[PDB]
Amino acid sequence: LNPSEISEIIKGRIEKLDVASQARNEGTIVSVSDGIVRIYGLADVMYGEMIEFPGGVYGMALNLEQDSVGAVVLGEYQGLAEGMNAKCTGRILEVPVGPELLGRVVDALGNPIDGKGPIDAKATDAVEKVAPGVIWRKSVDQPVQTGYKSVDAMIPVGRGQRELIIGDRQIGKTALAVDAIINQKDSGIKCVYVAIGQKQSTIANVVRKLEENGALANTIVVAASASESAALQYLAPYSGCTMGEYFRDRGEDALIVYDDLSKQAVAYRQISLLLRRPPGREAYPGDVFYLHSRLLERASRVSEEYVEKFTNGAVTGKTGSLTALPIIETQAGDVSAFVPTNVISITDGQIFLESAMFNSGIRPAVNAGISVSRVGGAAQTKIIKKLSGGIRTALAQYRELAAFAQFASDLDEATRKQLEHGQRVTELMKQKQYAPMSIAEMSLSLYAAERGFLQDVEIAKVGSFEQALISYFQREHAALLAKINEKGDFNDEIDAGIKAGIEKFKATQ
């Protein structure tokens, strides 16, 4: 297992060492307080430049005054002391980018924390950027499938869309975003998951659930846990966004989750209040809308001319995109609070998760009254857009009539049948964790709801009915499901084959 000659690497490192003197621009630490260091000197430092301290500690220059430089420490500050040396690096704040980060867990500066060796990235890129302009965009029409029936039927997400996931604590926000990540393992869309302010055992459970479902090799994980510095918690979404923008700028497609943007705003509030900046609503800084809007604008779809301009002619005739799913935690259903209303004013729709529907066992818990997608059916495939026109109206007729089931035997026929269809569509949209459905299976369930094949089936046997129907179409009509799973086409042949299979299921099974 371990021969002795393979440890001769040290000799080769000695043969690639430059021992010539190089000129540096240097300074001295004057004061250290709460992650903020004042430095004398450093007369050639740039705004946003990494500053090297002893022990491998870096900082970023924020306040270039005439006689001092204020820097924010990008790590633990507690080993820094007055009198220690500071050096310019020549580098505005960078992260490594590339396909070599796929499968790896890193921190906010790209250093690996999973114990699987060094990352051999061939390129770095800047953390702070301005998003590309008005003329370089293209309108969103390709689908991103989350694998959930309620999300892919009602609130569809496209390539380049920003779609917020918002709701109270412990009602499934990480679950919806992680299952949207796991459904990209055979679709060509690469994935970035940024955890901000979470517990480390939660992050390790998330990466173990990514490896157990076969999607870790498609996903970069960037982690800044709850006992890190607030600088790394503030800077980790932009670092993961640069990691997704590598695949955006070369005509490929990526998808990023920010699993709490609400904890990033708390960390930026901490940094701004320690700099004695004057606050506004809820003690947040005045530029807090700008904190989210500089990030989420970077998620976009860019045209073929932008991709041809970026790669200098290497990639021709391809668009690239980056889809974002930010996540916001609310307090007791208050969606009119300052940070939630700032992020709604930025995204292209949102998915509201309701605590009462979660506590009644309606487990994907999507409030269909107020969830919306601004792109809509321009992103959707044809069979899914055709069969989901009657879902939202069946859930709408159920909203008020769901409290009438205790006296519904003394009601008229249209109100009774609308309430029966509402209970059937509500029982159809329940779905377990870690069970994705394809285009053909959600089309089978949506056709079973929409065309009236749920009418003689009771409520407690709806979803078991759905599972049996899926199994029957997997063993009798597998070429039909492979026809639907190509690009989601719909015509009269597919219509007739689905309705003949459902009638043979309802007659013989």
Partner: protein, 232 residues
């Protein structure tokens, strides 16, 4: 500077919008000023796009559209919509969106207003559309403590009403020509007594207030009829 008191033009000629609540309870005038107040995701942009589409029917002059601190995707959609339907050659577009540093967002509405002032001083009747005028004001928040100023109430700049007045008093019709203006106005955390909309209210002829409760009932265009007034 603003045009003088002797150069002001009066007029109350009605502008029909085709929308029932707007024509009923807060009617518009040609050469007048319109605010569309509302919180996050209640409709402001959808209403402005409908007001652009229906005010374009009986208007034959030019238009200036200024995007101040809003979505870059909305700018690309509106440009490709006007280019596809061949009305792009009447409209001048200025954009300083949410992705920009705050000097660009602080000064882009002055550029769009300068182009509308040149069209007004050639003796024409022009339309001026500004999506979020609140985003000029918030850019003046972001640089205010860096300019050495002590904060006013709820962290705003102390020069709030003067920056609003120096911008809003150039938008008017004069005796040379007329400007009809539609401006979307953001309300922070759905609070109408926040100082930025509360200073914005007296600069306008017609005020359309949108409501999250009326839109949560399913009613669009979501106008509160007891909170929307106009002098017409």
């Amino acid at each position: 500077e603003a045009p003088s008191y002797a150069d002001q033009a009066g007029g109350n000629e009605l502008l029909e919008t085709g929308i029932k609540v707007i024509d009923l309870v807060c009617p518009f005038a040609k050469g007048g000023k319109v605010g569309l107040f509302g919180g996050a995701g209640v409709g402001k942009t959808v209403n402005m796009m409908e007001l652009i589409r229906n005010i374009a029917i009986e208007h034959s002059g030019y238009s200036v559209f200024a995007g101040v601190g809003e979505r870059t995707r909305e700018g690309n959609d509106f440009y490709h919509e006007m280019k596809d339907s061949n009305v792009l050659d009447k409209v001048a577009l200025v954009y300083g969106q949410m992705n920009e540093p705050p000097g660009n967002r602080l000064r882009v509405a002055l550029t769009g207003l300068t182009m509308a002032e040149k069209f007004r001083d050639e003796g024409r009747d022009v339309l001026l559309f500004i999506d979020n005028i609140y985003r000029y004001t918030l850019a003046g928040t972001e640089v205010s403590a860096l300019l050495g100023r002590m904060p006013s109430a709820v962290g705003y700049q102390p020069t709030l009403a003067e920056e609003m007045g120096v911008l809003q008093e150039r938008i008017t019709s004069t005796k040379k020509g007329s400007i009809t203006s539609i401006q979307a106005v953001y309300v922070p955390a759905d609070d109408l007594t926040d100082p930025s909309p509360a200073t914005t209210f007296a600069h306008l002829d017609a005020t359309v207030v949108l409501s999250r409760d009326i839109a949560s009932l399913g009613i669009y265009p979501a106008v509160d009829p007891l909170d929307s007034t106009s002098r017409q």
